[PDB]
Amino acid sequence: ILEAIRDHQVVIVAGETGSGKTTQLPKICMELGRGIKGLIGHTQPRRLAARTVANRIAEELKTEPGGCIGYKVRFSDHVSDNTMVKLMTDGILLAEIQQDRLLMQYDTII
RNA sequence: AUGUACGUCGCACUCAAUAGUCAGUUUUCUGUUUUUUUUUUUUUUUUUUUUUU
């Protein structure tokens, strides 16, 4: 899956219940070279689905939430300037449509 | 002046009684009194689900 993103502009990964693609796909992005020039967006259907996995990537990468791996849901802007991973639900990115139409804030959206 | 005239009669009530004509299969329901009032205005009733500068 690390090889598919460098060769294709849209990659689709289908996972099962115990797959873990929710927890390792942002880790693939920073390995490829993303995260620096733009933020790594990860769209989730629920905030508690988005919040729980946002603390998970920080704990797996031995950092704290709100720093490099931060989550932005309704007014819970735990985002610093040193961030690369930006967890957010489908409504948050839809709320950022009017602010940024071209989505110049990111480089990889999940 | 003289002489001159008299006798019998009838009526009523009535009036009865008569020609011929034989027969009609068996069985059945229908039937009685009594408490009487016929009618009493009604109520609020349940839940997949999930995301937004």
UniProtKB/Swiss-Prot annotation:
Domain Helicase ATP-binding: 2-110
Residues of the full protein shown: 86 to 195 of 1300
Role description: Not yet known.
Annotated protein name in UniProt: ATP-dependent RNA helicase HrpA
Source lineage: Bacteria, Pseudomonadati, Pseudomonadota, Gammaproteobacteria, Enterobacterales
Family in the record: Belongs to the DEAD box helicase family. DEAH subfamily.
Protein origin, superkingdom: Bacteria
Sites where the protein binds ATP: G15, E16, T17, G18, S19, G20, K21, T22
